């Protein structure tokens, strides 16, 4: 009841002489607006770097250790804080 | 006189205290099997809206809160866009009832009961939505400060707990300032009954009033205090229904001019509903001599004077979204003007700050086929403001990997389109059983026109 | 009639709703069940005012 008719069976295209890749494919679009239940919404970092994945290379890390860190001032909070001891 | 020519714009022809009481005591006391049409065909259209309301709720409890279409990015949808819309509608029903009574104004007099009752039924339609948008609606008593065998209380930092405290104060003093107004009025429907089973009905709703200066002085010092207590209430209620976005840290939600700009939009969308309801209460009930067109010339000016504060609100929150150097509020401007839901914000600038900017001219204020199209573009448009505030800030937010869409299902439409049933089920029960115009106050307005003509 | 003593009944119940709801949420958050909820302080003197104001309007109009 889980895996019945969820996708297309790719095993009907294996040919036992080209069982992993072959170059004789014809696409020939015959449909429109499938469901395709995806769970990400946006696969594109929208300038939200410094907040999602700070990416650098090792060439710039061996000269500066905290090159992806932002040495900024302590933020101000009006709620105070609690003591986790 | 400069003051007498103000009061003569509110009544018109020759009117006494009886001819005023007769034309309001003929909307009521016209018996069934003699009751004019329109009210039967509307009360059975509202029944099909109420059976669309009670079926969408019986669905909602049984299968769940997730037949709506609310996603996990945007988890507040038509249950909250229509809730702030309905709460927004009843607020100018109490600007008419309470805020204008502070100003001793006499053009609020005939617009009173069609705005006191219009507040209540836009709260009874509203107040179901904070009780049914919860996924477990049978525990909404947990948002009440009661003692139990759990040591648990509500939070009292969330602005949805204050929504309990605002509406359950707004719902009870709307039905206490409209029932107090009906205490001296249902004593007049009692004495005009001449039928003891409808005389006992209005002789028990009105508790036994008699008039009397020792009761009339105690009435108005309990009315203007109530009109002085319902005026910081509704500037707070739709501010507290405004804090439950502005408490949240979201980029389109965490703006700090939300509390005066929502209540501006409440006395913008609300005056649009009083205009959308009273233009078909002159052509159908013959109230051309009580709801004279100066009342719409002044309801249009206050709707205009409220529609600029939200015209200020759209430009301030698009300025301080740019004036903040956030990438999340830079994106907020480029997600209302561009992006997938850009049509909603451009059907908002058109319907709120472009089309009802014809309200400056009297040509589109005295003309009721033009004031109706302007006010019908505010109820659709101020729904779209609360869609832009709620959905367009929720469906795209800080993290790009949580960007949703919220296309509503039929049970989001059928609950909203069914909610107009429960409004007009009770509004058509209000029109038939209760006076639509406060008779004793417009008797004072007839007395005020006579006492200023006698000063000559 | 020389007026009525009714506005002092409205104020006497408004001072009992304002000081009765502000002391309700303070007794909840400090004495009865103090909760680290959001890192916010126990005596949150903001966020008690939009709930002690609506208790001031409620008990005043219940005396009005």
PDB file of N, CA and C in Angstrom, chain B residues 195-244:
ATOM      1  N   UNK B 195     -50.509  43.617  21.071  1.00  0.00           N
ATOM      2  CA  UNK B 195     -50.593  42.167  20.917  1.00  0.00           C
ATOM      3  C   UNK B 195     -49.749  41.595  22.045  1.00  0.00           C
ATOM      4  N   UNK B 196     -50.391  40.925  23.005  1.00  0.00           N
ATOM      5  CA  UNK B 196     -49.764  40.729  24.307  1.00  0.00           C
ATOM      6  C   UNK B 196     -48.647  39.684  24.256  1.00  0.00           C
ATOM      7  N   UNK B 197     -48.610  38.836  23.232  1.00  0.00           N
ATOM      8  CA  UNK B 197     -47.506  37.888  23.146  1.00  0.00           C
ATOM      9  C   UNK B 197     -46.300  38.442  22.402  1.00  0.00           C
ATOM     10  N   UNK B 198     -46.442  39.569  21.703  1.00  0.00           N
ATOM     11  CA  UNK B 198     -45.281  40.321  21.243  1.00  0.00           C
ATOM     12  C   UNK B 198     -45.040  41.537  22.131  1.00  0.00           C
ATOM     13  N   UNK B 199     -46.010  41.906  22.968  1.00  0.00           N
ATOM     14  CA  UNK B 199     -45.774  42.919  23.987  1.00  0.00           C
ATOM     15  C   UNK B 199     -44.969  42.354  25.149  1.00  0.00           C
ATOM     16  N   UNK B 200     -45.242  41.107  25.541  1.00  0.00           N
ATOM     17  CA  UNK B 200     -44.451  40.454  26.578  1.00  0.00           C
ATOM     18  C   UNK B 200     -43.041  40.127  26.109  1.00  0.00           C
ATOM     19  N   UNK B 201     -42.833  39.994  24.798  1.00  0.00           N
ATOM     20  CA  UNK B 201     -41.493  39.757  24.275  1.00  0.00           C
ATOM     21  C   UNK B 201     -40.631  41.004  24.411  1.00  0.00           C
ATOM     22  N   UNK B 202     -41.159  42.155  24.003  1.00  0.00           N
ATOM     23  CA  UNK B 202     -40.436  43.409  24.150  1.00  0.00           C
ATOM     24  C   UNK B 202     -40.632  44.040  25.520  1.00  0.00           C
ATOM     25  N   UNK B 203     -41.524  43.492  26.342  1.00  0.00           N
ATOM     26  CA  UNK B 203     -41.650  43.908  27.722  1.00  0.00           C
ATOM     27  C   UNK B 203     -40.759  43.162  28.675  1.00  0.00           C
ATOM     28  N   UNK B 204     -40.072  42.131  28.189  1.00  0.00           N
ATOM     29  CA  UNK B 204     -39.058  41.432  28.962  1.00  0.00           C
ATOM     30  C   UNK B 204     -37.651  41.641  28.431  1.00  0.00           C
ATOM     31  N   UNK B 205     -37.501  41.915  27.134  1.00  0.00           N
ATOM     32  CA  UNK B 205     -36.205  42.329  26.610  1.00  0.00           C
ATOM     33  C   UNK B 205     -35.822  43.697  27.156  1.00  0.00           C
ATOM     34  N   UNK B 206     -36.703  44.680  27.007  1.00  0.00           N
ATOM     35  CA  UNK B 206     -36.627  45.875  27.831  1.00  0.00           C
ATOM     36  C   UNK B 206     -37.141  45.519  29.215  1.00  0.00           C
ATOM     37  N   UNK B 207     -36.323  45.768  30.237  1.00  0.00           N
ATOM     38  CA  UNK B 207     -36.587  45.226  31.565  1.00  0.00           C
ATOM     39  C   UNK B 207     -37.743  45.908  32.283  1.00  0.00           C
ATOM     40  N   UNK B 208     -38.264  46.999  31.740  1.00  0.00           N
ATOM     41  CA  UNK B 208     -39.198  47.856  32.432  1.00  0.00           C
ATOM     42  C   UNK B 208     -38.479  49.158  32.688  1.00  0.00           C
ATOM     43  N   UNK B 209     -38.707  50.130  31.817  1.00  0.00           N
ATOM     44  CA  UNK B 209     -37.807  51.263  31.679  1.00  0.00           C
ATOM     45  C   UNK B 209     -38.421  52.585  32.099  1.00  0.00           C
ATOM     46  N   UNK B 210     -39.667  52.845  31.683  1.00  0.00           N
ATOM     47  CA  UNK B 210     -40.537  53.949  32.104  1.00  0.00           C
ATOM     48  C   UNK B 210     -40.067  55.337  31.678  1.00  0.00           C
ATOM     49  N   UNK B 211     -38.884  55.450  31.079  1.00  0.00           N
ATOM     50  CA  UNK B 211     -38.269  56.756  31.015  1.00  0.00           C
ATOM     51  C   UNK B 211     -37.880  57.222  32.410  1.00  0.00           C
ATOM     52  N   UNK B 212     -37.920  58.534  32.609  1.00  0.00           N
ATOM     53  CA  UNK B 212     -37.634  59.098  33.914  1.00  0.00           C
ATOM     54  C   UNK B 212     -36.283  59.774  33.977  1.00  0.00           C
ATOM     55  N   UNK B 213     -36.239  60.992  34.526  1.00  0.00           N
ATOM     56  CA  UNK B 213     -34.990  61.744  34.585  1.00  0.00           C
ATOM     57  C   UNK B 213     -33.977  61.091  35.513  1.00  0.00           C
ATOM     58  N   UNK B 214     -34.440  60.425  36.569  1.00  0.00           N
ATOM     59  CA  UNK B 214     -33.535  59.659  37.412  1.00  0.00           C
ATOM     60  C   UNK B 214     -33.034  58.395  36.728  1.00  0.00           C
ATOM     61  N   UNK B 215     -33.681  57.964  35.647  1.00  0.00           N
ATOM     62  CA  UNK B 215     -33.176  56.884  34.814  1.00  0.00           C
ATOM     63  C   UNK B 215     -32.535  57.379  33.531  1.00  0.00           C
ATOM     64  N   UNK B 216     -32.933  58.552  33.034  1.00  0.00           N
ATOM     65  CA  UNK B 216     -32.317  59.080  31.822  1.00  0.00           C
ATOM     66  C   UNK B 216     -30.946  59.669  32.103  1.00  0.00           C
ATOM     67  N   UNK B 217     -30.773  60.294  33.269  1.00  0.00           N
ATOM     68  CA  UNK B 217     -29.456  60.793  33.644  1.00  0.00           C
ATOM     69  C   UNK B 217     -28.504  59.642  33.917  1.00  0.00           C
ATOM     70  N   UNK B 218     -28.988  58.592  34.582  1.00  0.00           N
ATOM     71  CA  UNK B 218     -28.167  57.412  34.806  1.00  0.00           C
ATOM     72  C   UNK B 218     -27.908  56.636  33.527  1.00  0.00           C
ATOM     73  N   UNK B 219     -28.742  56.805  32.503  1.00  0.00           N
ATOM     74  CA  UNK B 219     -28.506  56.109  31.245  1.00  0.00           C
ATOM     75  C   UNK B 219     -27.322  56.710  30.502  1.00  0.00           C
ATOM     76  N   UNK B 220     -27.330  58.028  30.303  1.00  0.00           N
ATOM     77  CA  UNK B 220     -26.284  58.648  29.502  1.00  0.00           C
ATOM     78  C   UNK B 220     -24.955  58.768  30.227  1.00  0.00           C
ATOM     79  N   UNK B 221     -24.942  58.821  31.562  1.00  0.00           N
ATOM     80  CA  UNK B 221     -23.664  58.712  32.263  1.00  0.00           C
ATOM     81  C   UNK B 221     -23.179  57.277  32.340  1.00  0.00           C
ATOM     82  N   UNK B 222     -24.005  56.314  31.946  1.00  0.00           N
ATOM     83  CA  UNK B 222     -23.546  54.963  31.683  1.00  0.00           C
ATOM     84  C   UNK B 222     -23.423  54.679  30.198  1.00  0.00           C
ATOM     85  N   UNK B 223     -23.845  55.607  29.342  1.00  0.00           N
ATOM     86  CA  UNK B 223     -23.662  55.432  27.908  1.00  0.00           C
ATOM     87  C   UNK B 223     -22.380  56.079  27.410  1.00  0.00           C
ATOM     88  N   UNK B 224     -22.106  57.326  27.801  1.00  0.00           N
ATOM     89  CA  UNK B 224     -20.889  57.983  27.340  1.00  0.00           C
ATOM     90  C   UNK B 224     -19.647  57.444  28.030  1.00  0.00           C
ATOM     91  N   UNK B 225     -19.786  56.896  29.236  1.00  0.00           N
ATOM     92  CA  UNK B 225     -18.676  56.167  29.832  1.00  0.00           C
ATOM     93  C   UNK B 225     -18.451  54.865  29.078  1.00  0.00           C
ATOM     94  N   UNK B 226     -19.534  54.177  28.715  1.00  0.00           N
ATOM     95  CA  UNK B 226     -19.422  53.024  27.827  1.00  0.00           C
ATOM     96  C   UNK B 226     -18.949  53.429  26.438  1.00  0.00           C
ATOM     97  N   UNK B 227     -19.377  54.595  25.953  1.00  0.00           N
ATOM     98  CA  UNK B 227     -18.806  55.123  24.723  1.00  0.00           C
ATOM     99  C   UNK B 227     -17.403  55.655  24.931  1.00  0.00           C
ATOM    100  N   UNK B 228     -17.021  55.929  26.173  1.00  0.00           N
ATOM    101  CA  UNK B 228     -15.651  56.232  26.514  1.00  0.00           C
ATOM    102  C   UNK B 228     -14.830  55.040  26.933  1.00  0.00           C
ATOM    103  N   UNK B 229     -15.463  53.878  27.111  1.00  0.00           N
ATOM    104  CA  UNK B 229     -14.764  52.624  27.360  1.00  0.00           C
ATOM    105  C   UNK B 229     -14.660  51.753  26.124  1.00  0.00           C
ATOM    106  N   UNK B 230     -15.594  51.878  25.190  1.00  0.00           N
ATOM    107  CA  UNK B 230     -15.497  51.186  23.918  1.00  0.00           C
ATOM    108  C   UNK B 230     -14.634  51.937  22.917  1.00  0.00           C
ATOM    109  N   UNK B 231     -14.279  53.192  23.189  1.00  0.00           N
ATOM    110  CA  UNK B 231     -13.318  53.841  22.306  1.00  0.00           C
ATOM    111  C   UNK B 231     -11.845  53.484  22.550  1.00  0.00           C
ATOM    112  N   UNK B 232     -11.315  53.235  23.764  1.00  0.00           N
ATOM    113  CA  UNK B 232      -9.961  52.684  23.803  1.00  0.00           C
ATOM    114  C   UNK B 232      -9.944  51.188  23.628  1.00  0.00           C
ATOM    115  N   UNK B 233     -11.108  50.549  23.653  1.00  0.00           N
ATOM    116  CA  UNK B 233     -11.205  49.120  23.433  1.00  0.00           C
ATOM    117  C   UNK B 233     -10.939  48.781  21.980  1.00  0.00           C
ATOM    118  N   UNK B 234     -11.654  49.435  21.069  1.00  0.00           N
ATOM    119  CA  UNK B 234     -11.534  49.083  19.665  1.00  0.00           C
ATOM    120  C   UNK B 234     -10.291  49.682  19.029  1.00  0.00           C
ATOM    121  N   UNK B 235      -9.701  50.713  19.627  1.00  0.00           N
ATOM    122  CA  UNK B 235      -8.345  51.053  19.229  1.00  0.00           C
ATOM    123  C   UNK B 235      -7.324  50.084  19.796  1.00  0.00           C
ATOM    124  N   UNK B 236      -7.711  49.257  20.766  1.00  0.00           N
ATOM    125  CA  UNK B 236      -6.847  48.217  21.301  1.00  0.00           C
ATOM    126  C   UNK B 236      -7.150  46.842  20.751  1.00  0.00           C
ATOM    127  N   UNK B 237      -8.427  46.521  20.505  1.00  0.00           N
ATOM    128  CA  UNK B 237      -8.786  45.181  20.036  1.00  0.00           C
ATOM    129  C   UNK B 237      -8.151  44.915  18.683  1.00  0.00           C
ATOM    130  N   UNK B 238      -8.418  45.771  17.701  1.00  0.00           N
ATOM    131  CA  UNK B 238      -7.783  45.558  16.411  1.00  0.00           C
ATOM    132  C   UNK B 238      -6.329  46.019  16.402  1.00  0.00           C
ATOM    133  N   UNK B 239      -5.823  46.543  17.516  1.00  0.00           N
ATOM    134  CA  UNK B 239      -4.394  46.582  17.776  1.00  0.00           C
ATOM    135  C   UNK B 239      -3.884  45.284  18.376  1.00  0.00           C
ATOM    136  N   UNK B 240      -4.718  44.570  19.130  1.00  0.00           N
ATOM    137  CA  UNK B 240      -4.309  43.290  19.695  1.00  0.00           C
ATOM    138  C   UNK B 240      -4.456  42.175  18.658  1.00  0.00           C
ATOM    139  N   UNK B 241      -5.458  42.271  17.771  1.00  0.00           N
ATOM    140  CA  UNK B 241      -5.477  41.485  16.534  1.00  0.00           C
ATOM    141  C   UNK B 241      -4.452  42.000  15.528  1.00  0.00           C
ATOM    142  N   UNK B 242      -3.734  43.069  15.848  1.00  0.00           N
ATOM    143  CA  UNK B 242      -2.583  43.486  15.070  1.00  0.00           C
ATOM    144  C   UNK B 242      -1.265  43.096  15.700  1.00  0.00           C
ATOM    145  N   UNK B 243      -1.237  42.911  17.018  1.00  0.00           N
ATOM    146  CA  UNK B 243      -0.004  42.490  17.661  1.00  0.00           C
ATOM    147  C   UNK B 243       0.304  41.033  17.364  1.00  0.00           C
ATOM    148  N   UNK B 244      -0.704  40.206  17.067  1.00  0.00           N
ATOM    149  CA  UNK B 244      -0.416  38.797  16.795  1.00  0.00           C
ATOM    150  C   UNK B 244       0.156  38.552  15.408  1.00  0.00           C
TER     151      UNK B 244
END
